[model samples]
Target: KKISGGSVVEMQGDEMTRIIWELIKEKLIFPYVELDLHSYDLGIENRDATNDQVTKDAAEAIKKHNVGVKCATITPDEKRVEEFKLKQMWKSPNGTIRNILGGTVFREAIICKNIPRLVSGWVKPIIIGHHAYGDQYRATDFVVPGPGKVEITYTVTYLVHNFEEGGGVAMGMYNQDKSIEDFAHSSFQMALSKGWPLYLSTKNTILKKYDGRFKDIFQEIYDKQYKSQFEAQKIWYEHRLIDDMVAQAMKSEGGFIWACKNYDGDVQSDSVAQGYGSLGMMTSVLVCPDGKTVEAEAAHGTVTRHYRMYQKGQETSTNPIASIFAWTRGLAHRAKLDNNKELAFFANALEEVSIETIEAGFMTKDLAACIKGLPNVQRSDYLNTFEFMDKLGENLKIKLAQAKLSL
Candidate 1:
């Protein structure tokens, strides 16, 4: 009998991951747990057809249900707009969803024993809790055509810059204390749950007022609300300059949560993801301020290169570990919400099976290329997409049966 995992929003995506999404359900999810799923298609074609209302509806569904597992989708560029004949270059579904959800996105890499890391010192996972609100992403900037003064005015006017000699660019950005407070709560909640220390990174020394607010808000919240809880867990929260934090991250063995402002998170997460191994191995979770609502997905985009080859009837081995983890992580959240022990055990088992299978060398071409150089890898070293999914299904069955027998 399959375990009941309660209700969750199921968002179908685009291209290569869309195909893998169905396979994942058939081979891994459907066979073990029964879920009440609210399905929404946020595929590019569907989004264009529906005038992008599907993305909004999906976000609303997640808000109601509190759990969502998403597949990677295409965020259209000019080329993609022409390729798909899109109505308009739809904004990123992720950005749309995050706007509605209002949360911190925490990305963590899946560590396998056999995979080699560029940062060899990292044995465990370094989770990046990125504050997805305000800063550079929403900034307004323009080039000065001639020598002129740039001024910023709210109630009073303050000169931003003086372009006396040559034309230069000027811009302004802002962050709300409300958003920063929520980000701190989310980060502290994540660190407490993981039993790891948390570090908030900012350029406070440089942008004292702008970045200083983030540091101050986090400190206030930590000192007032989370201090006792964190201390009881033997975990601590601290602030560090973004530059020093990066250097410390590179040297330390991973097992800490680093909270970053919008721009810093956007850059550092990519760098850290590469250091671990592949973006295909990183899982992203949107932890809402309430700490109850959550959405999970793979960190990588739709595997377009592999999708192109698959369309031509050629063999393509794309990694699916992160996609699989999307299910496990989302279900784990559901398990916690419902306090369903059986569901929780099943979620953990599936995750363990995923790592163990890869460690045993039943992996995709990307991982094989990581072990042996891309030029040196051969066909026999890695399994095809279908073969790897089937292998996982087979192993999961064995694992569950063993648990049942022991019980």
Candidate 2:
């Protein structure tokens, strides 16, 4: 039974991950923490049945409730469209959710002592702040056929706010000042929360006003509102050219946040993910400007291939740590809102037991593959998916029971 009381917008997703989601609840979360689950099914069938309104409704609910724990969902291609059958091709659920939430999504690696990292020297974390809104993601880009100059013309009150068009190409992109401000606050808030230094990376030297606006805004906002707080916390903020920032990131030992403009983030975050070792160990959190609201989820996608294997009655050893952390992160946020210390303790203990299990050499095939010799890997080296969950459940119970001894 659970003592701390609060609700979460529980979003279920697709494929092997969806199966893992239910097992995690049964084996881990539901047994320990009681939560009001305002659940929504974001699976393809339900999404198609609801005409994708379920996704929109889920995002709105997260706004109202202030916390959501999501599973990895399918963003359709032609194959998915045919397999799911009927209805117009839907947009990304994550995008729809984030568009409604209006925030930056941060990706962090879950560290385990036994896991070997590419950057072995990085003992601490280097958090990645991705500006999820605007830039190339929402931009208009197309090649113009030769011989005609392309002109970008926007009419307001019948007058043209315009730019010349060229034969080769033309692209248009714009970012909201308010959105950038929200991003700035969120980034600074995270740094202050962790008591770590922050760096904003941009190509201000070239796109003086375009990208420079990002550079200027972060620096200006930091100096105005966050500087004193950062100084009080003994953390600092700085601006760097994108190139120099990338170079510094590769060389420096981790322990800070690298804030990137919309585009720079896409490339760099993936680089950081690989170096951190496994996507299986990655967790993502969407932080709103208020710093009170968030939507947490696994950083990877639906394990469709593994799900296919499971459908054929073959067992799959898919990793569930990220999905499990999705719950921990969401519940932990609820714990924060309610000032529920015991609930927080439960969340932390569960996370610790998870890492401890992996460190003890009980892990999924995904993590086993992270070992140095992949070709020679044997089945005994990794627990099948259910066994790993069982290990976590059994360990969690022991942990909580022992914790009762102290009480």
Candidate 3:
């Protein structure tokens, strides 16, 4: 088997995902891809131990290598706060990484024949481009009691502090034109690369000034720069109302780029995941406007319950496809940057083997539940976490050997 040679930044995460992460590299990545890894442990304990310095280091490494694949991490909430007992509730490492990397997150669905989908119409992939910087992730909310005149200003002290008493809640969020510009360009570039229709979804009809700016800016940029290129590539760009877009998405057969504002993206990507199958198959790639940097990972969170069960020596089945994709997708970026088609084919072949393996009835419990409803599923119906990895590893060797013949 040929080994993929390139530099890749690898960031490890927390919980059962960490367990799955080790198995992924041991069985799937290392055996096949021979590459340089600038590894950083962004695990919750590690981040807290390093005062989250490891996250910054990992982000810096991603910027240096221009390619990274991260495992699922715990973005701690109040419960996690008490559980970890941290100095401060450190912000999301993803937010910090994006601050350094400056890109739009695009989540694409991985469709497999054996996987049963909620939406039968979709036969292809629907890539969701989430403008992750503003509108919600950075919002400040305040509870306004009895018409005391709620206001938003930079000088105000309402930055996540709790109010003693209030009747209604007021929220303030913003987006920079520069950031929106970068998002627009990244969406266009990704759409062009995929050769799919690009759509920007918003509540422009209501939020005339706010979301209208997003709609207008995307259109303006598309007409000014990307329109001609899109036309030449036989693709098109359109703006859709968030509600209508969801309806259209449900009915359409996939194969389009849905460019969403930060808020809508978080909300809709869930539906997209369910409609296609499990979040286990969803791959999140952070793409910069320059198209030189990409950080790939699974869209889901750490399997907390699964980790607890595994810690108790109980058998558990956790899907690892999305996490595995974090490698293949990152390696694909390395392939483009280095013009290594061999590496690209290797990445693609591994992915093909992964999905086809699932279609062949070798999958984790999560996917088995998707195929056969939870009530009908038995313990023996699906492979355990490590067993699934070994199965994929076996299939990958067969795929690589077949490719060797063609080459």
Candidate 4:
């Protein structure tokens, strides 16, 4: 079969991550695959230089191409502004890209055998698909120091109407039915692709109307469009109370899919990341309404400290596994878009090897420290960023040869 040729857009970002991004290209993509890279530099200085137009343009290009792989960039918080001497605190490149994509985000932790899971039983991953709009990120807020009687009312558009004059409605969350439906579609589609059961968690038992609206919407999709396919695939979809969901999540073996509202997702995602231990190996995908449009990147922030170490002639042991997978998953999605099974297989195989190689023994300091099963992994046990990627390429070459034998 001929290899599928697809256009790839690459966006470069700030500091430690920026350096690691180059290594990723030189060591991984450059060696194994001939990629057509549409490159944009989002380094802090350049972002300032372009008055942040570059980030916007890059995101537009990704939308145009339908697939994008992004490097970790500075979101330019207050501290970053001082450090970089920026004109303004620029928004996150991801936030902008996602704004353009207008999608649901699914964050997944890459599992390795040697890496100790904070949630030990999570051998696979509990992919969380969060509705990126209007549950909490945009909620109106107030601090009620005293309890007041409260009555909640629902508007026709599915927004909230509250009479705070009463003594006891401490907080309220509202989800438009349309938003919930969009979220459900994204979640179901993601679940379908992974062949994983989808669990939509909400405080339905308490917020009967508000959260229940979400549960109801997800159920409708599963029953209408998704249930038949899920049953055919032997996968399932269910709703659970948020508290119960947490309890079940802690005890359950990994490899489930969860659809969370804005707040639950934001909080639980961090908890899940902590459970897995290193954000470096975590991959976050923004799957928009169109589904085919995806923006991929490592979930962790740009390691500025690590970048400084490298600047000082110090060897930096940054984890590049997730970064590599950004390329792989983005490429995999491109393969799916192009209907090129060979590229898809290669993408999957390479991602799997990155995880398995770590499982077999090689890993970075942060990951090795989290390894519980085997004690005392020395520096020699794992290759540095450069060598580790070379190792992956070698493995990929061997595997590709073996894969062709079956054909």
Best prediction by lDDT: 1
RMSD of each: 1.8, 3.1, 3.6, 4.3
Displacement of the residue 1 alpha carbon in candidate 4, Å: 12
Candidate 1 regions with alpha-carbon error over 4 angstroms = 134-137, 262-269
Superposed model 4: Cα runs more than 4 Å off:
1-3, 134-137, 140-175, 205-207, 262-269, 372-382, 401-407
Predicted candidate 2 versus true structure: per-residue lDDT over 1-407, tens digit per residue = 57544878989999999999999999898877777889999988899999999999999999999989999999888988898785978988888888788778888888887787887877776888888744323566776665554454565232212334535655666677887888898898878767899988877655566777777788899889889999998889998778998787677778889887745323224466677778778888888878788899998888778999999999899989989898888888888888989888988899999999999999988788787467867999999989999999999999999999985
* lDDT of each residue in 1-407, candidate 1, tens digit only: 78988999999998899999999998899878898989999999999999999999999999999999999989888999999888899988887887788877889999998999978888999898777643323557788888878999995888888778988778776666777888888898888778999998877666667777787888999999889998898889999888898899879998999887644323224566787778789988888878899999988889899899889998888788889999999999999999999999999999999999999989999899889989999999999998898999999999999999994
Sort by TM-score, top down from the best: 1, 2, 3, 4
After best superposition, candidate 4 residue 328: deviation in angstroms? 1.2
Ranking of models by lDDT: 1, 3, 2, 4
Once model 4 is optimally superposed onto the true structure by TM-score, how far is the C-alpha of residue 390 displaced, in angstroms? 3.0
lDDT of 3 by residue, 203-278 (tens): 7665568787788888899989988888898999999888999898889888999987645323324556776678
Q: How does model 2 fare in lDDT?
A: 0.83
lDDT per residue as tens, model 4, 313-402: 877678888788898889998998889776788788888778877877777767766763327766765566566666776776777788
For all predicted structures, in order, the TM-scores are 0.96, 0.92, 0.92, 0.85
Steric clashes per prediction: 0, 3, 0, 7
TM-score of 4: 0.85
lDDT of each: 0.87, 0.83, 0.83, 0.75
Q: After TM-score superposition, what is the CA distance of residue 81 in candidate 4 from its true location, in Å? A: 1.4
